[PDB]
Design a protein around this ligand. Structure first.
Ligand SMILES: Cc1cc2nc3c(=O)[nH]c(=O)nc-3n(C[C@H](O)[C@H](O)[C@H](O)COP(=O)(O)O)c2cc1C
Length: 169
């Protein structure tokens, strides 16, 4: 209940990742798993620590459930909150828009006064452009189940270890 993880998913990949992240943190006593499809913008208010998960769809766009709540995000005050991000994407098929959704959400939420935590290296990927890159780092964990499924488990373990420090855990 300390950390609220909100994800959106179209073909279920982002939900599986969300479930692995909750698992690595220690389970339901540490992280609440919430499908953004069933949530209201104000649900994000109940947490001081947030994890936002979103896959990029339709060439650089938000997954539709995140799309639907996007304009309501202005009603939440993120001042003082630490927010981490993760996303699923396909670097080979969408080289010019890899993980754009994660970047779109981070730009919106950070502008509302939150603190981004959980930066990730871009070197383990091959892509041309991404809206989720700032000063040569991803603003969150990039997962690619389409082309790099073998790296997913270690990526999540490593990222969660580094987030524990950031969330005072
Ligand atoms: C129609 C379609 C469009 C996609 N567009 C993008 C894109 O613009 N950028 C990207 O990084 N991945 C893109 N992908 C890859 C998906 O984000 C990826 O398959 C992801 O695992 C889907 O997650 P989900 O199951 O949680 O919805 C696309 C996939 C499909 C089938």
């Amino acid at each position: 209940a300390k950390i609220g993880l909100f994800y959106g998913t179209q073909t279920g990949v982002t939900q599986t990742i969300a479930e692995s992240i909750q698992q690595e943190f220690g389970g339901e006593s540490i992280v609440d798993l919430n499908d953004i499809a069933n949530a209201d913008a104000s649900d994000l208010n109940a947490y001081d620590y947030l994890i936002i998960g979103c896959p990029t769809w339709n060439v650089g766009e938000l997954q539709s459930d995140w799309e639907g709540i996007y304009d309501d995000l202005d009603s939440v005050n993120f001042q003082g909150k630490k927010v981490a991000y993760f996303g699923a994407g396909d670097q080979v098929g969408y080289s010019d828009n890899f993980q754009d959704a994660m970047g779109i959400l981070e730009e919106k939420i950070s502008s509302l006064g939150s603190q981004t935590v959980g930066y990730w290296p871009i070197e383990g990927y091959d892509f041309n452009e991404s809206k989720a890159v700032r000063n040569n780092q991803f603003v969150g964990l990039a997962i690619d189940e389409d082309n790099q499924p073998d790296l997913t488990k270690n990526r999540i373990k490593t990222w969660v270890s580094q987030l524990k420090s950031e969330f005072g855990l």
